[PDB]
Structures are given as C-alpha cells and as structure tokens.
Amino acid sequence: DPKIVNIGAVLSTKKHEQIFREAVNQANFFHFTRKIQLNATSVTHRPNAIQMALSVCEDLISSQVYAILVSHPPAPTDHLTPTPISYTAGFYRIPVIGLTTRMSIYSDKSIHLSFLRTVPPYSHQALVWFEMMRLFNWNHVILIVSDDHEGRAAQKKLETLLEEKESKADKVLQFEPGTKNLTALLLEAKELEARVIILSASEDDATAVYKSAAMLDMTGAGYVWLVGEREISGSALRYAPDGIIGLQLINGKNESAHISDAVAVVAQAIHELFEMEQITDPPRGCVGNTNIWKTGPLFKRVLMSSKYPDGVTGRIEFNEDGDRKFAQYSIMNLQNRKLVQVGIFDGSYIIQNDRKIIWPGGETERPQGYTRLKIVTIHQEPFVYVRPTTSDGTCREEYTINGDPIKKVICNGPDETIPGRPTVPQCCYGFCVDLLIKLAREMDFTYEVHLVADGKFGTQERVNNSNAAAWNGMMGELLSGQADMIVAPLTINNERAQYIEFSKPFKYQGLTILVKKEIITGINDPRLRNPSDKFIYATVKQSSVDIYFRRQVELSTMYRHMEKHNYESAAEAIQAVRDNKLHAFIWDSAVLEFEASQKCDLVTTGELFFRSGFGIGMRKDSPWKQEVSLNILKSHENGFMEELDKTWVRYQECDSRS
Amino acid sequence: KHPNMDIAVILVGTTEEVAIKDVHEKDDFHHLPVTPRVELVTMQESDPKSIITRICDLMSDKKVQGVVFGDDTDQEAIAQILDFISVQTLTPILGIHGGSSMIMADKEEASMFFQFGPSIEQQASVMLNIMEEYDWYIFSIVTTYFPGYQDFENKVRSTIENSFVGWELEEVIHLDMSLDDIDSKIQNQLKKLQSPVILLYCTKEEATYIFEVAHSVGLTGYGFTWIVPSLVAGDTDTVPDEFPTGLISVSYDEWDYDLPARVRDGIAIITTAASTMLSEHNSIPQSKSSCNNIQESRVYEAHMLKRYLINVTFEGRDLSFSEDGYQMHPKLVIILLNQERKWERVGKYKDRSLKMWPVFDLYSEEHKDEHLSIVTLEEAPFVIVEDVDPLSGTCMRNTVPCRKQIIKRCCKGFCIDILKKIAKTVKFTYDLYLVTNGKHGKKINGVWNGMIGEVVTKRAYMAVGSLTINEERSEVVDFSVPFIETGISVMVSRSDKKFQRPNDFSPAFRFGTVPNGSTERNIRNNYLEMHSYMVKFNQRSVQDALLSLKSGKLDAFIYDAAVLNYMAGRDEGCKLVTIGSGKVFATTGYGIAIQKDSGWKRQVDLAILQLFGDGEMEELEALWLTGICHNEK
C-alpha cells in the first residue's frame, strides 16, 4: 500500500510553490513509490510572524509534515524573518531547512535545535579569509565587527580558526550598530601596526564604516580590506572604497535550485530513514499535542549525515550546527568602481580566475601588510666584526672574496682603547648583520644597533636575597629592554629559554676543542679525565660552557679543572693556544672552525658535543619573533644561509693534518 | 479622570474542568491610582496554536495592557512561547507557576517577559551553598545544550573562583539531545567521570533519559549524589522514578503561598508598575492589544514601563527582577526526594542567606587506596612470554600471569622482576595483561596506539616494558626515571653521512629498523631521507631483522641499544657486534608510564633507585642482561 508522507514549506511566491511540488514529484518518481510516496504542501510568506506561525500549526502541521522548508520573503522585514518557524517546528522537533537564511544566529543549536540550512552563515565566510590570509602570509590583521550575535559569531569563528595556529588576536574592534560616526575607533585602529583589515557589518552600518574610513584615508594602499557579502551590496556598494576584496555566495539569491536539492536531500534522508524501525508519524495538527515527536531528532541526525554529494547547488554535507559545509563563494573586486570576479572559491581551496589582482589605490600587484628595534650584540669574530668609522666618514667599501661590496652598520659599544671605558660609536659588519638587514627588507621593521657594554653575552649573578639583580650582559639588556631584540651568535639552552622566546636556529653547531696541529680523543677525553697542572685546558668564565659545567651534575666534578686559568675573551683564548701558553682551548664550533680555517696552525678535534644552535633572542611577549622564526626557516630553504656561511667561512687554507 | 487599567489572567490545568474562576481580583490596596479591570479565562492543555490564538483572541479590541500566565504543566517550552508573543505585542506578560516559571533562553532586551522562577545564576549559587554546607568540595557538571548552559557554566565559574576553599571541578559535559543517540554517547562519556557530587542541567524530559543511562552506567549509587536545578523538578507533582532517590534539588514552595496568592502578586506588580509610571508621567499605560495588525502607536514608548517594572514592592514584599526577567530573590526551598515518591523539603533559602535542617550523614586501606592494572609487550631479554606447562595448569616460579585478548600467557623477565621488586617495596597489588593493538605506542595521523592507548583510556594505570622515552610521551604521561643505559644503536658484522646517503657510495648500501618504533618516529622527525630510504629495509620482527643481517642480504641493523648489546653478548656464534664502543646517540633509558601529574609518582621513583641503591641491578644485569660473547674483551 502507498503511504503519503507530507512535507511542508514557506516560500516567496506561488510559482516557487509549483517548483517545490515539481521537485517533490521528481523525488517520488525516482524512488520507490510502492513502499512510500512523498506529498508536498506549502504557503506564501505572511505579513507578521504570528500569521505564519499560526499557518504552520494550522495549515502545515495539520498535514503531518515530516519537515519544513523556509525561504526569505520578497521584502525582508527586519532580519531573520524565518525566526518563528525554527521555534514552532522546534517544539515538536520537526526538522526545518532554510534556503535563503544566511543569518548566523541560527547556528547555535541551543536556541534553534531543529535548524538546518543549504547555505553557510555569514560567520563561515571566515573560512575564506583564513585561507586568504593563509596564501598571502599575513598573520597580522584587524577585525572590525558590529556588536550582535552575528559579528561576535564571526569573531569567534575566525579566532577559533586561529586557535589551531598560535592564537592571533592582532587586534579586535567592536562597534555597536546604527552608529553614524565611527571615527574614534578607527583612530585607535591606525595605531595598530597590522595594515590589513577585515570587517563584518550590515549594509547601512558598512556605509558609515566606509564613510568614516575614507575620512582617515584608511582606504589607501598599504591597507587591505576583506569583507562579507552584505558589505559589498546595497547602499554600501555606493560608498565602498576602491580595490576592496569581497565575497558573494553562489546561488544565494535563488531559492529554486536550493529547493530541488533540499527536497532531493529530504527524499534521500526519508528513504534512508524508513530503513529504520520504531518510527512514528509527526503529530497530527497542533491542537491537543503537548508532546514532542521522538523521531524528529533522528530525522535530523540522518539528514545531517545524508551525503548525496551530487546536487544542483554543489557539494552537500552538514557541520555540527546543521550549517552547510563545503559551500562555494565567488570573490569580487571593486575595479573601476564596479564588481568583477578576480577569482572564485569552491571547496576548501581558493581558485584564481584569470583576472588581474586589484588592491586599494593603484597596484598592478601589491600584497603589502603589517617602529624601531634596538639591537644588541657582542664582539665575536666570525659573525661580528668591529672597526671604528674613519673620522666622521662611515664604512669601508671593502669587498668579500666573492666579488661583492661588504655591507656595514653603526654600533655603539664598549671600548677598551681609552683608559676609561666610554660607550663608543663604532662600525660593525657581520653575517648576523647581513641576516638582520635581510630580515629588514623582508620585515616591516627598521634597525638601530649598539653592542652591549659587558663583553659577556649573559649569565645569572649577584645578590642572595629573594632573587636579586639579573644575569649580566646583553641578555640582561633584553629583559631590561635596553635592546628589544638580540642579534648575535647565541647558543640556545633551557635555563635561558624559560625567561625568553628563542628564534629558530640560523646555525647548528656544537662545542669542540682547538689544539695546534704541528708535530683530544673525544668530548670525553681521558686526557681531560686525567687532568694535569702540566697540561692546561682553558675556557672563559661566564661563557655558556661554564653554565653547562655548573648546571650539569654528571660532569660536575670535571668543571673545576676547567675553571682554573680561565680567559676573559675569545681573542685571548685563541691567542693562548697560538702563543702556546695553553695547550688546549674549548669553545663552540661556529666561532672556532672559522678560526681553524683562518690559521691552520691550530686545529679542531673530535665530535661536536653539546650539539646546539644559534638563535635571535626576543621576549616571549613580543609576537615579532613569530615572524622571525617564520622568516628564518624561509631563509634556510632557499640556501641563503649556506651561501652566507660560504661567504663568511673562507675555507681557503687548511686540511686534515695527519 | 477615572484611570481604570485593562488586565487579563489565565490558568491552565488546575486539575479541574471548572478550574477555580475569578477566585481573586477582589479589591485590595484600592488606594493605588489605577483600578484593575480583569478578564479571566482558562484553557485545559497547552499548545502553541491554542495559546497564541486565545491570547490574541482576548486581545481583540479589548486592548489589554498586561497578562499573567499560570499552568499545572511541567512543560519547559511554554514560557518562551508567551515571551514570543510579548516580543510581538510589547505587552507585558509574566507567569507564576510551573513551566512559565521554569527558566528560558535569555530574553530579548526589547521584549518584555517575566518569571517567578529563580534566576539560573541564583539557582547555581544555591547549589553551591548546598554543597558547601555538606562540605562536598569536589564535583563535576553534566549539562545539555538547552538554553542557559554557559550562563550556568559561567555562573558556577564565577561563584567557584572567589572562594578560598580548594574545591575541584572535575569535568564539564555538553551533549546534544538532538542527534539522539544509537551510540549511547552520553553513556560513553558519563561512564568516564569519577566525581562524587554531580550537578545536572537539562529539560524535564532529558533528565529522564540521562538518568536511565546513569542507572545503566552505575552513577546513581553508593556515595555519588546528584544535585539539580528548578527545571527538572518542575511542578514536583509528578515524578518518574527513573530519577534516582537521594536526588537533591531546589524549587519554589506551594505550601508557603498558594497559587492564587502568587497571582495576586502578579496583578499587584502590574498595577503597581502602572501606578508608578502614572506618578512619573501622569499617563495611561493602556494600549491597543490586537496582535494581527501593526503594534499600536506609542506602544513603542512602552520601554520605560519595563524600566519601571523591574523592581516592584507591595505587602512589605519585594518583587524586584533581574535584567533577564527572573525575580531577583524569590524565597526558595531546598528539596530532596524522600524514599519512595515523596518530595520532602530539607532546606529554606532567602536573599543572601541559606538555612538547612539535617545535621549529619544526610541520606579500604588507611594508608592508601585503589587497584592498578598494567599492560606490557613481549621483548627479549626484558619481557619474555612463555607458554605455561599445560599439566601444571598455572604459572611457575618467577613467571607472573599476563592475559592477551584475541588465553593465559606467562610473562617473566626484566620488566617482571623490576615490577615485582617495586610492588614488594611500595606494597600494592596489580593485574598484568598484554597489549593487542600496536604493541608499543604508535601514531597514525591524529591518534595514539599501543599500551599508551590503554594508559590514556585508563584501561591501564602504568605501562611497563622495553618502552623507550621521548618528549611526546613525557608530555602526555609522566615517566619513571631510567633504570638502564640504552638508546638507538647499530649492530653489524666485521655522523659520517654514509648513513645520510647510500647513493654517494656506488654499490647500494643497506640499513633498516623496526617500524612503529620510537626510533623510526625520531628518525622521521630529525632525518627524513633516511626514513624514506629505509622504509624498504624495514623488517617484520627482531628475530626476522636478525634474519636479514645473519644470512646476508643486509649489511647493518639498527635498534634499541640494550637489546643490541644483549644480542651482542648472546649469539649462536660471535658473528655480531656493536658499533664503536656501542656509545649511543639519543642517549636514553627505559621508563614507565603513569597517567598525569596525579599519580603515586615520586613514590615509584624512590623505589627504583633503591633497587640500584642495594646493588640488586648489577646482579639482575649479570643474570638477565649479560651475554656470553664480548668474551675476548
């Protein structure tokens, strides 16, 4: 016997009702009519909420609908005019499917628990922005939202996207709707370094946003705008700035495609449903039933999981909230004050249309985004060199072995040349300097460098009570803020690591020993293990190696022998071996190997132990380091470092002597 | 001149057809400037259509300026419905009993709706006072997606943070009643929580399902206790015994004041708000009531009424509301389910302060407690599985039983002995079994595998074996200090980058390791090319890997250093040796799993180095670890 299973809907016009019934009949024809049949019922939108709710309880539910479809009316009244149905069906847990409601407030299962849609909300548009942000590599942006469930939801979604990454709240800006003048808030926005902006608001609000933004000239180049579908449309389009980036959902305007597809999905869901037993028909009529419909949540469960990827609208799958997944948007550009498709977005991946990119103001291509850095260093020969500027004149045109002129920068640092020690203006040129300027071209920052007063990089010291003072040296300057960032050859260790953030290593090296070749088995050398007053092994007190000796318990005995006859600086330490004052010298390879090449009278031996890396210091609180590492890696992949080590490590004359 | 207001009130239920009509409205406090004009109507059972139709029907031309709703029903939904009408009408509506009094989603600010039920926040506060009174410090929350969640979670969070006491929030659970479950997903979560005192939040109907499921889970019994808000208890007239006994919840009392007295309170609030609004603007509140047409003009002006109506006082009694529309502090009663079906009062609570009646006891090793099941895997020499003598029927000597789901297998070896000494010293007893999925823990995409899985699933407290140590596992689970010197190493017959590329050497070179190992994962992390190349040289098992080395067809083998050293010592011929001094990179030791920061923890660690502290480990090394080879020394 056939069984007539009703469906119900509220649609804009009788023609669309006919479209609905037609799609339903297509569903009946193409699936078993012997077992089950589908029947269609629908009604036009009513002027108030109440006539319509009454229509659902009377005109629809009296027909025992298993589900309801809803569309936005011809003239939108306020917003979320399909609010009542979600509540009304919701009492009985009758599933509701909206065609045209992109509104975000329906995403919370709590308030509307029966609500599903064939379109993603405005909040989900953020999926694009993250992907957009992903491609262009701007991690720094600004978000401008209206204050309501819509804007706050958008913020939550985008931030949630960012949560997988280090959470990025570069800045967030909330304004309340209906406010004609927003100027002050944007004045606050300019102060924020990040130059890319994204906003969500209503059309009327957006007019005010662009109106206020143009006054402060934030529509100009070096600034980027990302926006919602609503923002580009309407009166907002009229006052919209040039070069803006914009979004439009596909088939958002059409109810009918979504009708055919939604009903198709409903049919698949039902036919999949009746495979299950212990089913109950929905309540007949509103009157006399105070009870929910036990099947309804199940119908929702299958319907959310209902696949059928082939559809007139595109791929169909439903997120947890019942919102649609994998929807497609078409990116839009404002070129010549007109809307154009620069690209189109479908699935999880953006697609680039052949059209040329536009940015605000004049750009053929301009992806630009995102004020001082005090930098500190130490005098370490391979990665840093010190010469004073000749008189007032600045720096020598001296050239690298590969023909290039040597770059150089000014640095204020300790001078031992005068009997008293003045902080002296000096010229410094280095591997780390070339790296720093490489970053400076890559990074928005500008740099001024002065060498730390203390020759030591840093070590914890001084007074007993509480914890008193702080580690002496450039590191101490970093915490103190004397320099906000540290560029030098610094080994990276946990004891320091808790105090500060560390950039990904530019270099990888480990400690080793220098001894003259011309006539040390291991890091563990019996000769070290068999110390002798006669055979010296020398180091610098307060050098990080000393921290290795003090912190480590296992070798703690061995530290003391090294402690004897310590040298103050690197040059003196190399010299002692060269002078033959000291038979052996212990230091990390990166500083040592270059010297090993430099003389060849002296040699490095054994295997780098205490294997470590050199990195640029920053406070954990400063986010610029996030880019720095991100940049460091980018510098590693291209072989930039390899060529820089190749330049600054000469390798000219030396060999394995034996 | 004469300002007579227009008002309507409805009662549903009352357990009567011919429900008591117009019992009240009788002139009281007539002095108030506006006199009430009342029309009373009753309807038997609730519906969205019936209620909407009737309320609009009473609206007609009648032009009522206020409505009070009351019900015999337990239904949650009703309040929201009437609230919706309010949003549409801008005509004030409130309710004195049952569902309308039951909590609802946060009210639209423009909308005017009020409830004589307590605030969600207030209720949470009372629940906290109750727990504090019995000094039940440690508790968890089970909630559902119903509205007020997270207003509740937040309120509990705020109330809890301030207090000095070291209370513990154990778990918070959010489960959608929608997408109703075949999975018993609620059973699967609820089964997890170990906490003694549970706060539940949901619709009246939902509580039943959650409770049947709890009854299956075993959560209703013996020492655990449940505490509930207004909604579940509702009217309290009807109580499915699916609810467990000893269930504790707060509700408004019928006895103190009967429903007509409450209705009198509502009428008094409406007419007092009218009188105050009058005093302020000398203006009639009366407005056209008809919903069907557009809302009457100057009704938009009505907002101030809400502003006036929030706090109202008569009869020396405060009706003051909160921004949400719940009354600020209605009197409340602490109620319990007495044995059988009784709802019998336990406490009274008002304003700031709470008072409760019962004194005490409302409704096994001294040093330490519980039991620990342990999982392991077989590896030689350390953990050896042997088949027990069938004639004996049970394990012999040092062998300790271990079961593998697929049969009793007999485990003995290094892990068995170390574990045995540790158990002897810390004095606890334990159950030992064998792992099935993935042996030592293995990661495919997002998820962990192996003994670590049983450590995470809490199917195992501690995992023992030849398991190596790494940063990830130390991150997820606390590890014991290393008992033995071990690590990655090489075993061959007899950093250079010879390993880095085979292709540099014209003949093809060969080296491989066992997959799903800490070694292979470490390799993939640091050295990619080696992994991608060595996947071809990967071997099924250590005996088989040994087959690849021993019979030829493979040059070098790489594996754990302890195993490679013991194998160095033990070989059918001294055909195999270690690399260099066998000094291993990635210097590590065998650790032991624990759950997290909460564990016997340090107590274990001490025990371990006591083992070496008495020198037992050297003996055990000579017996188990020492091989005969490395004989020419």
Curated annotation (Swiss-Prot), chain A:
Q: List the disulfide bonds in this chain.
A: 57-286, 395-427, 411-428, 600-654
Topology, Extracellular side: 1-519, 520-658
Topology of the protein relative to the lipid bilayer: Multi-pass membrane protein
* UniProt cross-references to Gene3D superfamilies, sorted A to Z: 3.40.50.2300, Periplasmic binding protein-like II
The reply on keyword Signal is: yes
Sites where a glycan is attached: 39, 181, 254, 278, 328, 346, 415, 444, 464, 627
Task: Name the predominant localization.
Answer: membrane
GO CC terms: neuron projection; NMDA selective glutamate receptor complex; plasma membrane; postsynaptic density membrane; postsynaptic membrane; synapse
Under catalytic activity, the entry for this protein gives: Ca(2+)(in) = Ca(2+)(out); Na(+)(in) = Na(+)(out); K(+)(in) = K(+)(out)
Please give one Gene Ontology molecular function term for this protein.
Answer: signaling receptor activity
Q: Which GO terms describe its biological process?
A: calcium ion transmembrane transport; chemical synaptic transmission; ionotropic glutamate receptor signaling pathway; regulation of membrane potential; regulation of synaptic plasticity; response to zinc ion; sodium ion transmembrane transport
Q: What does this protein do?
A: Component of N-methyl-D-aspartate (NMDA) receptors (NMDARs) that function as heterotetrameric, ligand-gated cation channels with high calcium permeability and voltage-dependent block by Mg(2+). NMDARs participate in synaptic plasticity. Channel activation requires binding of the neurotransmitter L-glutamate to the GluN2 subunit, glycine binding to the GluN1 subunit, plus membrane depolarization to eliminate channel inhibition by Mg(2+). NMDARs mediate simultaneously the potasium efflux and the influx of calcium and sodium.
Q: How does it assemble?
A: Heterotetramer; the NMDAR subunits are modular and harbor tiered domains that function in concert to regulate opening and closing of the cation-selective ion channel pore. Forms heterotetrameric channels composed of two GluN1/zeta subunits (GRIN1), and two identical GluN2/epsilon subunits (GRIN2A, GRIN2B, GRIN2C or GRIN2D) or GluN3 subunits (GRIN3A or GRIN3B) (in vitro). Does not form functional channels by itself.
Q: What is known of its domains?
A: A hydrophobic region that gives rise to the prediction of a transmembrane span does not cross the membrane, but is part of a discontinuously helical region that dips into the membrane and is probably part of the pore and of the selectivity filter.
Q: Tell me the protein's name.
A: Glutamate receptor ionotropic, NMDA 1
Species per Swiss-Prot/TrEMBL record: Xenopus laevis
Curated annotation (Swiss-Prot), chain B:
Indicate the quaternary assembly.
Heterotetramer. Forms heterotetrameric channels composed of two GluN1/zeta subunits (GRIN1), and two identical GluN2/epsilon subunits (GRIN2A, GRIN2B, GRIN2C or GRIN2D) or GluN3 subunits (GRIN3A or GRIN3B) (in vitro). In vivo, the subunit composition may depend on the expression levels of the different subunits.
The protein's name in its UniProt record: Glutamate receptor ionotropic, NMDA 2B
Q: Does the keyword Glycoprotein apply?
A: yes
Q: Which part of the entire sequence is included in the shown chain?
A: 26 to 802 of 1448
GO CC field: late endosome; lysosome; NMDA selective glutamate receptor complex; plasma membrane; postsynaptic density membrane; postsynaptic membrane
Which residues are noted in the entry as L-glutamate-binding? 468, 473, 518-519, 560
Give a GO biological-process term: synaptic transmission, glutamatergic
GO MF terms held by the record: metal ion binding; NMDA glutamate receptor activity; transmitter-gated monoatomic ion channel activity involved in regulation of postsynaptic membrane potential
Q: Which organism is it from?
A: Xenopus laevis (African clawed frog)
| Organism lineage | Eukaryota, Metazoa, Chordata, Craniata, Vertebrata
Print the domain comment field.
A hydrophobic region that gives rise to the prediction of a transmembrane span does not cross the membrane, but is part of a discontinuously helical region that dips into the membrane and is probably part of the pore and of the selectivity filter.
* Sugar-bearing residue positions: 311, 516
Could you list this entry's UniProt keywords, alphabetically sorted.
Calcium, Cell membrane, Disulfide bond, Glycoprotein, Ion channel, Ion transport, Ligand-gated ion channel, Magnesium, Membrane, Metal-binding, Postsynaptic cell membrane, Receptor, Signal, Synapse, Transmembrane, Transmembrane helix, Transport, Zinc
Q: In which tissues is it expressed?
A: Detected in oocytes.
Taken from the UniProt record, the cysteine pairs bridged by disulfide bonds within this chain are 56-291, 395-410, 402-411, 574-629
> Which stretches of this protein does UniProt put in the Extracellular compartment?
1-494, 495-633
Q: What does this protein do?
A: Component of N-methyl-D-aspartate (NMDA) receptors (NMDARs) that function as heterotetrameric, ligand-gated cation channels with high calcium permeability and voltage-dependent block by Mg(2+). Channel activation requires binding of the neurotransmitter L-glutamate to the GluN2 subunit, glycine binding to the GluN1 subunit, plus membrane depolarization to eliminate channel inhibition by Mg(2+). NMDARs mediate simultaneously the potasium efflux and the influx of calcium and sodium.
Q: What is its main location?
A: membrane
Query: Localized where?
Result: Cell membrane; Postsynaptic cell membrane
Residue stretches in coiled coil? none
The entry's family comment says: Belongs to the glutamate-gated ion channel (TC 1.A.10.1) family. NR2B/GRIN2B subfamily.
Superkingdom of the source?
Eukaryota
Which residues participate in Zn(2+) binding? 97, 254
